[PDB]
């Protein structure tokens with residue numbers, strides 16, 4: 463509107479007043495995305511971007527928020543003439559969605575760093591004419607709600623955002639960019655990406671948000687970071703409370719990554735009487751299994767990261783083996799580079815550092831070490847198996863000799879007598895990839911044959927002539 467009933471909690475003088483606003487909005491038929499995003503971006507601005515003058519909480523006065531809201535609705539209503547796009551069926555057309563996407567896109571500053579913090583909200587859009595990639599998608603959905611287009615909803619993968627709309631909410635449209643130096647496909651469907659079985663489009667098992675999930679998205683999108691070394695405790699507390707509000711109302715049921723975010727917040731500062739972080743990570747994974755065919759990677763990455771921080775080697779390896787078991791049934795496509803980067807960092811940095819510490823601790827007499835547990839060696843092997851299987855049939859390869867050195871080093875952290883105890887069947891482990899099936903021979907020698915490993919992992923045809 464803003465409607466009279468939306469205004470009665472103002473001014474917001476505290477974290478808990480913001481929470482009350484969210485609770486009130488979530489109790490309405492259609493929570494007001496524009497109002498909520500402006501409020502979050504306002505408080506984020508004054509708690510993370512510019513804390514000059516801060517004494518407790520940046521009071522959000524109705525006059526200030528209403529004026530921001532008016533700037534948004536005036537910009538959208540002036541630019542989008544709904545009479546030019548007649549709505550058949552109480553649903554929107556592709557042309558109308560593209561128009562809204564154009565209006566947001568064309569409003570943005572000509573030149574800015576797209577990867578900077580605090581450019582996610584409508585507050586950034588109105589005051590700085592800056593949005594990040596998924597911020598543009600959110601803004602298009604907020605603009606469509608403001609226009610009365612109840613069918614337009616946010617669609618989310620693990621690295622991208624677009625909208626669904628139209629009859630039965632069955633249409634898809636690109637509304638923002640993806641990555642850096644990819645050609646924009648705004649206006650198009652996502653069918654080619656679903657059909658090529660890329661991770662970016664999750665084989666079609668992406669999130670199709672309702673309004674409540676779009677609220678959850680903006681809450682996950684809060685960025686408490688003040689700088690590299692410093693987070694806003696106020697914004698961490700706000701995000702954590704809003705996530706629990708959403709959780710209690712049922713709106714994180716179909717949002718795996720939000721559960722992982724909340725688990726991470728609880729690890730940092732536990733809320734008395736709430737589920738442990740581990741419980742929450744496992745609920746994230748359950749969500750992915752239940753609603754998204756177990757086709758998501760981050761629920762397992764979140765779990766693994768928690769075990770890695772707690773130096774739980776065994777359970778970190780199991781979770782990373784599970785991440786690889788998901789990825790194996792995708793094709794590695796152009797525009798999947800963020801998930802390649804994650805797997806690369808885990809294989810080539812995180813696991814080696816973890817195993818190096820484990821090796822030192824073993825030398826010092828640790829008992830029950832992952833390095834003496836053949837089931838842990840099997841998890842490491844299943845992690846590599848899934849990466850190798852991922853690469854099979856992909857249009858772009860994954861592995862290269864830069865991975866092989868770390869594989870040899872990681873295998874060698876397990877003594878031969880531990881490695882011997884895994885039974886590789888055609889602990890028991892079965893390999894899905896042809897690369898690992900050929901490597902089986904090499905995996906039990908007391909001294910691993912480094913060169914042969916390297917040849918098998920990279921499928922390098924020849925050794926040096928001279």
Ligand SMILES: N#Cc1cc2cc(CN3CCC(Nc4ncnc5sc(CC(F)(F)F)cc45)CC3)ccc2n1CC(N)=O
Pocket residue numbers: 596618619620621622623679682719720760763764766767770803804805807808812
């Ligand atoms: N092990 C481990 C591990 C844990 C872990 C945790 C993270 C944390 N990120 C996990 C993903 C999370 N992303 C999200 N969280 C909620 N909602 C959304 S919707 C969306 C798509 C977009 F942006 F809208 F286009 C992304 C996304 C942002 C936080 C990143 C890499 C991680 N790793 C891999 C690593 N390299 O350490």
